[PDB]
C-alpha cells in the first residue's frame, strides 16, 4: 500500500492522487448543486397550492434521502472510475523510461565511475610528468650540443697538430723516430770503427 | 485522524512533488556546473605547459691561448727532427768515407 | 489497515526529506566547486625513466679533456728532450769526424 507515485510525478508535476481529490470535491459539489436546484425549484412550485399545504421540512429530508442514495452510488462509482484513472491514465507504465533520464538507461555503475575518476586524476598526473620529462630530455640534448662541440674542438686541435707536423717536413713522427734511431745506430757503429782505426 | 490525515497527506504530497522536481531538474543544473568545472580544470592544466626547468650548468671552456703554444713548439720539434733526419745520413757518408782509406 | 498505511507514509516523509536534503547539499556542492575553480585561474616515474636516469657525467668529460692536454704537453716535453739528446750526439759526431785532419 501507500504508493507515493514518485515517478508519476516529475512528469505531470502534481501527483495523480491529489488530482483525483480535486476532481472528487468538484464532482460532489456539482451533485449537491443540482440537488439544491431541484429542492428550491419544487419549493417555489410548492407555494402554488391552494386548498391544502404540505410542509417543507418533509421535502427537505425527502431531498436528503435521494441525496444519501446519490452519495452511496456516486461515491462507489467514483472510486472505481478513479482506480481506472490511476491504472490507464496518470501512470508511467513502469515499462517506459522518461526522456528526462535516458542516460540512466545504461547506468554507469558506482565502481566503474570511481575507477574512471581515479583514472582521470592519475592521467592528469601522468600528463604532468610527461611534459616535464619532455623538458628534461630537450634540456639534456641542448646541454649535449656543448660537449659535442668541445670534443670537436679537441679533435680539431689534433688534426691541426698533424697539419703543423705535415708542414716543416715530419708528418709522421713515429716513422721519423724509427728511421732516426736506425741511422743513429749505423752512425754509432761506423763511428766506433773510425775511432778504433784512429790510432 | 481526519484533519490530521489531511495535513499529513498535504505535506506528503508537497514532498512527493518536491523530490520529483529535484530528481528531474537538479541533474541538469548540477550537470551545467560540472561541465563548467571540467572545462576550467582541463583549461588550467594546459597553463602548466611552460614547466621550463633551466638545468644547464657546465664546466665551460678553457680555450686555446696555450693550445697554439704547444702546437708552435710542435712546429719547432717537427722542423728540428726533419732537418736532423736530413743531416745525419750525410754524417753517415762522412763516416763510411773514412772506413777504407 | 489505516495504522500500517499512515506508518508507511510517515516513514516516506522522512526518507524523501533526507533525499531532498542530499539533493540540495549535492547541488550547492558542485555549484561552489565550479565557482572556486573558475575564480582560481585568474588570481618522476614517467615513460622511459631509464633514459632520464642514464645520464653520463659531462663535466667530468670536459675535465678529462683539460688533463688530456696536460698529458700531451709533457709528451712533447719528453720529445723535446729526446731531440736534444740526439743532435748533441750529432754535433759531437760531426766535430770528431772533422777532427780527422
Amino acid at each position: 500500500s501507500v504508493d507515493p507515485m514518485t515517478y508519476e510525478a516529475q512528469f505531470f508535476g502534481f501527483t495523480p492522487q491529489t488530482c483525483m481529490l480535486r476532481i472528487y470535491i468538484a464532482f460532489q459539489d456539482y451533485l449537491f448543486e443540482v440537488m439544491q436546484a431541484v429542492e428550491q425549484v419544487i419549493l417555489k412550485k410548492l407555494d402554488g397550492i391552494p386548498d391544502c399545504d404540505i410542509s417543507p421540512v418533509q421535502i427537505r429530508k425527502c431531498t436528503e434521502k435521494f441525496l444519501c442514495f446519490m452519495k452511496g452510488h456516486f461515491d462507489n462509482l467514483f472510486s472505481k472510475m478513479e482506480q481506472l484513472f490511476l491504472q490507464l491514465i496518470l501512470r508511467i507504465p513502469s515499462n517506459i523510461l522518461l526522456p528526462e533520464d535516458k542516460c540512466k538507461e545504461t547506468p554507469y555503475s558506482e565502481e566503474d565511475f570511481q575507477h574512471l575518476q581515479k583514472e582521470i586524476e592519475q592521467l592528469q598526473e601522468k600528463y604532468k610528468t610527461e611534459l616535464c620529462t619532455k623538458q628534461a630530455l630537450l634540456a639534456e640534448l641542448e646541454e649535449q650540443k656543448i660537449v659535442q662541440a668541445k670534443l670537436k674542438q679537441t679533435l680539431t686541435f689534433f688534426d691541426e697538430l698533424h697539419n703543423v707536423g705535415r708542414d716543416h717536413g715530419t708528418s709522421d713522427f713515429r716513422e721519423s723516430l724509427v728511421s732516426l734511431v736506425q741511422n743513429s745506430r749505423k752512425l754509432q757503429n761506423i763511428r766506433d770503427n773510425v775511432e778504433k782505426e784512429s790510432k | 485522524m481526519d484533519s490530521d490525515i489531511k495535513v499529513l497527506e498535504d505535506q506528503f504530497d508537497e514532498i512527493i512533488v518536491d523530490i520529483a522536481t529535484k530528481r528531474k531538474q537538479y541533474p541538469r543544473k548540477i550537470l551545467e556546473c560540472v561541465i563548467k568545472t571540467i572545462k576550467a580544470k582541463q583549461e588550467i592544466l594546459k597553463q602548466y605547459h611552460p614547466v621550463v626547468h633551466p638545468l644547464d650548468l657546465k664546466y665551460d671552456p678553457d680555450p686555446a691561448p696555450h693550445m697554439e703554444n704547444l702546437k708552435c713548439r710542435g712546429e719547432t720539434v717537427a722542423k728540428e727532427i726533419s732537418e736532423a733526419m736530413k743531416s745525419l745520413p750525410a754524417l753517415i757518408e762522412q763516416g763510411e768515407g773514412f772506413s777504407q782509406v | 489497515s489505516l495504522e500500517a498505511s499512515v506508518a508507511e507514509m510517515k516513514e516516506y516523509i522522512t526518507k524523501f526529506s533526507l533525499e531532498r536534503q542530499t539533493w540540495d547539499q549535492l547541488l550547492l556542492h558542485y555549484q561552489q566547486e565550479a565557482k572556486e575553480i573558475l575564480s582560481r585561474g585568474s588570481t618522476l616515474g614517467s615513460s622511459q625513466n631509464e633514459v632520464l636516469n642514464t645520464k653520463p657525467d659531462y663535466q667530468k668529460i670536459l675535465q678529462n679533456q683539460s688533463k688530456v692536454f696536460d698529458c700531451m704537453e709533457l709528451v712533447m716535453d719528453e720529445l723535446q728532450g729526446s731531440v736534444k739528446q740526439l743532435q748533441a750526439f750529432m754535433d759531437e759526431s760531426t766535430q770528431c769526424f772533422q777532427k780527422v785532419s
Binding site: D3, L21, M35 | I5, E9, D13 | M9
Partner: peptide, 13 residues
C-alpha cells in the same frame, strides 16, 4: 444543506 463527506484520503487501503 451540505453535510457532505469531506476528506477522501488520497493514498490508503
Amino acid at each position: 444543506l451540505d453535510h457532505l463527506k469531506n476528506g477522501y484520503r488520497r493514498r490508503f487501503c
